[PDB]
Amino acid sequence: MQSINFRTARGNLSEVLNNVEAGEEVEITRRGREPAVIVSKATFEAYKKAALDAEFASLFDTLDSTNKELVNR
Amino acid sequence: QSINFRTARGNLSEVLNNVEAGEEVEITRRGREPAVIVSKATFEAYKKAALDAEFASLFDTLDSTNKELVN
Amino acid sequence: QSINFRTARGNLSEVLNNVEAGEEVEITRRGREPAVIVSKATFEAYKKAALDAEFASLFDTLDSTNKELVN
Amino acid sequence: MQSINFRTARGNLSEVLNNVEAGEEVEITRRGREPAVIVSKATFEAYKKAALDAEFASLFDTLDSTNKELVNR
Amino acid sequence: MQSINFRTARGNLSEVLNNVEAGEEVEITRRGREPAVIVSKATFEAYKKAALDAEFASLFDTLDSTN
Amino acid sequence: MQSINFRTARGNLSEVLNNVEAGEEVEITRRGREPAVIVSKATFEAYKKAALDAEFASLFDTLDSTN
Amino acid sequence: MRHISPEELIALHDANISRYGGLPGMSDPGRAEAIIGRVQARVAYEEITDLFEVSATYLVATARGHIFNDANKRTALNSALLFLRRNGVQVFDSPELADLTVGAATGEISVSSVADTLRRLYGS
Amino acid sequence: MRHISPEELIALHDANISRYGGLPGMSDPGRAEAIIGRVQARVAYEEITDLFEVSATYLVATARGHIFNDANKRTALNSALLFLRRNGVQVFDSPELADLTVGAATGEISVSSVADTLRRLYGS
């Protein structure tokens, strides 16, 4: 994952958004700053959809009984 | 929080800060597929919760820190 | 509280009761000059506060319970 | 002031409203009921405008000083 | 809040919105339908916010307090 | 709350009111003017009542409590 | 107790507007019924029986409610004292009324505190 | 503490709607942000630090808020326990959860009382 400066990012953004849609995720760094990153909503939504689905899925496993009862309550 | 690339590149310091406060900032474009910008942590958080879920889908595990990727 | 005469004569028991609870009920009519219905007390209350004010306008007083009226 | 029953009133209302506008105020009575009365909004509004004007007018007299100060507060 | 029928609202709309911008609440009636209201967005947003604050508060009042 | 420009509201009004009756809040924008909102009267009245209850309550909160 | 109706408040205000001056009208259609109705419902709901607490409620709600485009302070003080007079309490002008009314209007003096002053000024 | 965002509540609800059934969607546009935003502001405003009082707030606001057309009770219980799990408290299904959740939803069990049960069920 290419790691670009603040300037490069801010100066060549549309180009960045061009690479990203091609599938490439790009980290942008700031001095004295925690990093950020950027890729298609699709590849961001895919990861976070993946994570939350699993976090909920197991929540539901654990409370499967009550979840099914509450349908009829 | 959705905004276009002009708005985005125009106030980028504020965008990155908003993101450094847990904000997910979609970056829209005229007739294009949108992008996203979030914290470094949060990103790998989803990634390192997503991978865990599809490694658990094969029912095996690891190490699948290899397909990172190198066939 | 304004209402027309049909509405008025139609639910008159309720009108008079509303009036017996301090309600002033205007009675409108198609292209006519409207009327009013209120308690007996309240009516003379205004009347016996109004007369007091125009008897005090001449600066004399009474008895002007004569113009009630009999020139 | 003519004093009419509940029936007469309810049965001959438009006629009542005809007499009233001619200036005549009409009391309507109910059995086991406090009486009511009715005349033109004009002659009802004239009396109540008369009464309240005087009730306020003297209120204002009593608080004339503060009323004038409060304009500039 | 003045009330206006449908045809009068389609027939004088620019000026409905003017009055509305000037702070008026205008009801629009339709024969055989439920009436609507046109009001400035700013006023609406502020009313809705207060309605939601109220709804939210009501959630924390048990059946005992209500009443 | 979908947003609709002026011309689209004058051009599709019967169905704006239908949607509105069906529970929708529709913003109407005018180039160079403040936006309006059309909403059912019932919903508006309930929002306004809550806004007034709130305004009234605020009257009894001194400058000390606010804050 | 006798109360002041929204309609009487409008009239009390209109007479004051014409006798002392100011911009005319209500700030919003039906706002007097909205505020004064709520004043009386507050009294009924909280069961307020002390005439001075009730009077102060009228004073504060009107001083801060901005029912009218103008003469809100004057209408507040007058409605509050008209309330007491109508309920058997004798009232008279005082050097404190202006500051008291301005403090009610700004939110610096609370209802109960407004009521205390009134209880001293006109109480038994 | 970690919180549940309005967007996560929507997603928690959508997954539950598809896994257990029910009518889909929100009862009104943006109602999840309206309720959950207010839940978090209540926590910040009242400075609620006890994890069980905070969890119960999620449970009650959602059980009674009617954010969704369906699965409001299920989303309430799940969001409340997901909250605790996310904050280091281990959770497990219990025979009391249904009644507790129904009581929260009807307004018969208050937040603090919901919190007590949770403090017993999962507290240390």
Side-chain angles (χ1 to χ4, degrees), chain A residues 1 3 5 7-9 11-12 14 16-17 19-24 27 29 32-37 39-42 44 46 48 50-73, chain B residues 2 4-5 7-14 17-19 21-27 31 34-37 41-46 49-54 56-57 62-64 69, chain C residues 2 4-5 7-14 17-19 21-27 31 34-37 41-46 49-54 56-57 62-64 69, chain D residues 1 3 5 7-9 11-12 14 16-17 19-24 27 29 32-37 39-42 44 46 48 50-73, chain E residues 1-3 5-9 11-67, chain F residues 1-3 5-9 11-67, chain G residues 1-89 91-124, chain H residues 1-89 91-124:
Chain A
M1 157 220 282
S3 193
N5 71 336
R7 297 153 48 202
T8 299
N12 316 273
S14 185
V16 169
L17 295 174
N19 306 307
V20 144
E21 185 80 297
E24 96 165 55
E27 160 187 39
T29 60
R33 267 52 197 62
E34 283 280 287
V37 175
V39 69
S40 284
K41 263 196 75 298
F44 168 78
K48 109 136 141 167
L52 296 167
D53 280 357
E55 174 177 45
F56 302 154
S58 70
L59 175 71
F60 300 166
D61 288 333
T62 305
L63 309 175
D64 199 59
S65 183
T66 303
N67 276 286
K68 269 176 288 202
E69 188 182 325
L70 286 180
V71 169
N72 296 110
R73 295 294 297 281
Chain B
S2 191
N4 69 224
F5 73 96
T7 300
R9 72 169 152 178
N11 293 56
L12 182 126
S13 295
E14 331 301 309
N17 289 337
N18 283 150
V19 163
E23 244 234 298
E24 294 171 8
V25 184
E26 181 190 21
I27 304 176
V36 171
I37 167 189
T42 297
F43 177 80
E44 301 290 21
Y46 293 128
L51 119 273
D52 298 324
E54 86 210 75
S57 196
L62 336 158
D63 194 12
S64 284
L69 46 328
Chain C
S2 191
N4 69 224
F5 73 96
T7 300
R9 72 169 152 178
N11 293 56
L12 182 126
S13 295
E14 331 301 309
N17 289 337
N18 283 150
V19 163
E23 244 234 298
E24 294 171 8
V25 184
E26 181 190 21
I27 304 176
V36 171
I37 167 189
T42 297
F43 177 80
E44 301 290 21
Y46 293 128
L51 119 273
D52 298 324
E54 86 210 75
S57 196
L62 336 158
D63 194 12
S64 284
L69 46 328
Chain D
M1 157 220 282
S3 193
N5 71 336
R7 297 153 48 202
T8 299
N12 316 273
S14 185
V16 169
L17 295 174
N19 306 307
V20 144
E21 185 80 297
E24 96 165 55
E27 160 187 39
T29 60
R33 267 52 197 62
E34 283 280 287
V37 175
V39 69
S40 284
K41 263 196 75 298
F44 168 78
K48 109 136 141 167
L52 296 167
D53 280 357
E55 174 177 45
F56 302 154
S58 70
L59 175 71
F60 300 166
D61 288 333
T62 305
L63 309 175
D64 199 59
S65 183
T66 303
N67 276 286
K68 269 176 288 202
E69 188 182 325
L70 286 180
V71 169
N72 296 110
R73 295 294 297 281
Chain E
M1 184 173 64
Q2 191 73 45
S3 180
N5 61 239
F6 182 73
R7 315 289 152 151
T8 304
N12 307 69
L13 185 67
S14 263
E15 44 201 310
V16 168
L17 290 162
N18 292 335
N19 297 49
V20 159
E21 189 165 356
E24 172 176 34
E25 314 180 334
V26 184
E27 185 189 332
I28 301 170
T29 59
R30 291 205 293 331
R31 307 270 297 185
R33 294 293 210 117
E34 288 297 78
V37 163
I38 179 186
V39 62
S40 68
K41 185 179 196 299
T43 295
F44 180 75
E45 293 314 328
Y47 285 4
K48 186 177 184 180
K49 180 187 178 306
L52 281 166
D53 294 345
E55 293 181 15
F56 188 78
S58 77
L59 279 35
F60 297 95
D61 296 312
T62 61
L63 244 40
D64 273 22
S65 311
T66 31
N67 45 336
Chain F
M1 184 173 64
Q2 191 73 45
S3 180
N5 61 239
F6 182 73
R7 315 289 152 151
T8 304
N12 307 69
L13 185 67
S14 263
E15 44 201 310
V16 168
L17 290 162
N18 292 335
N19 297 49
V20 159
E21 189 165 356
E24 172 176 34
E25 314 180 334
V26 184
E27 185 189 332
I28 301 170
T29 59
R30 292 205 293 331
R31 307 270 297 185
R33 294 293 210 117
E34 288 297 78
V37 163
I38 179 186
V39 62
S40 68
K41 185 179 196 299
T43 295
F44 180 75
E45 293 314 328
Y47 285 4
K48 186 177 184 180
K49 180 187 178 306
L52 281 166
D53 294 345
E55 293 181 15
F56 188 78
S58 77
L59 279 35
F60 297 95
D61 296 312
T62 61
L63 244 40
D64 273 22
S65 311
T66 31
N67 45 336
Chain G
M1 62 189 63
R2 279 190 76 187
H3 283 282
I4 317 309
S5 72
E7 187 182 359
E8 298 185 308
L9 193 86
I10 300 175
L12 189 177
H13 163 274
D14 292 339
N16 191 279
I17 275 290
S18 74
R19 173 168 169 173
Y20 294 106
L23 302 186
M26 269 184 195
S27 57
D28 201 54
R31 189 171 181 74
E33 190 145 293
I35 302 319
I36 297 305
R38 286 186 170 67
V39 160
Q40 293 176 21
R42 179 181 183 76
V43 173
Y45 180 79
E46 281 182 23
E47 309 167 77
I48 304 179
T49 50
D50 181 280
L51 297 187
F52 295 102
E53 193 70 12
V54 182
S55 182
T57 301
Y58 273 100
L59 203 165
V60 170
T62 304
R64 301 236 274 167
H66 191 274
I67 298 165
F68 306 98
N69 295 146
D70 206 330
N72 290 292
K73 280 196 286 294
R74 276 171 285 159
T75 303
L77 177 68
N78 295 325
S79 53
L81 272 66
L82 175 68
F83 173 81
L84 294 171
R85 188 164 83 179
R86 277 186 172 187
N87 283 282
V89 177
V91 297
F92 50 83
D93 207 341
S94 175
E96 297 182 56
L97 297 181
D99 293 329
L100 178 68
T101 306
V102 176
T106 53
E108 296 166 53
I109 302 172
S110 69
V111 269
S112 309
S113 184
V114 167
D116 296 336
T117 301
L118 302 178
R119 189 175 303 92
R120 174 169 55 71
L121 273 288
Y122 314 115
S124 183
Chain H
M1 62 189 63
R2 279 190 76 187
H3 283 282
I4 317 309
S5 72
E7 187 182 359
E8 298 185 308
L9 193 86
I10 300 175
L12 189 177
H13 163 274
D14 292 339
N16 191 279
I17 275 290
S18 74
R19 173 168 169 173
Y20 294 106
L23 302 186
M26 269 184 195
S27 57
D28 201 54
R31 189 171 181 74
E33 190 145 293
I35 302 319
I36 297 305
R38 286 186 170 67
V39 160
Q40 293 176 21
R42 179 181 183 76
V43 173
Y45 180 79
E46 281 182 23
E47 309 167 77
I48 304 179
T49 50
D50 181 280
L51 297 187
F52 295 102
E53 193 70 12
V54 182
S55 182
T57 301
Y58 273 100
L59 203 165
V60 170
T62 304
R64 301 236 274 167
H66 191 274
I67 298 165
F68 306 98
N69 295 146
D70 206 330
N72 290 292
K73 280 196 286 294
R74 276 171 285 159
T75 303
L77 177 68
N78 295 325
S79 53
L81 272 66
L82 175 68
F83 173 81
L84 294 171
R85 188 164 83 179
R86 277 186 172 187
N87 283 282
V89 177
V91 297
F92 50 83
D93 207 341
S94 175
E96 297 182 56
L97 297 181
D99 293 329
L100 178 68
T101 306
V102 176
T106 53
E108 296 166 53
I109 302 172
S110 69
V111 269
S112 309
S113 184
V114 167
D116 296 336
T117 301
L118 302 178
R119 189 175 303 92
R120 174 169 55 71
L121 273 288
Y122 314 115
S124 183

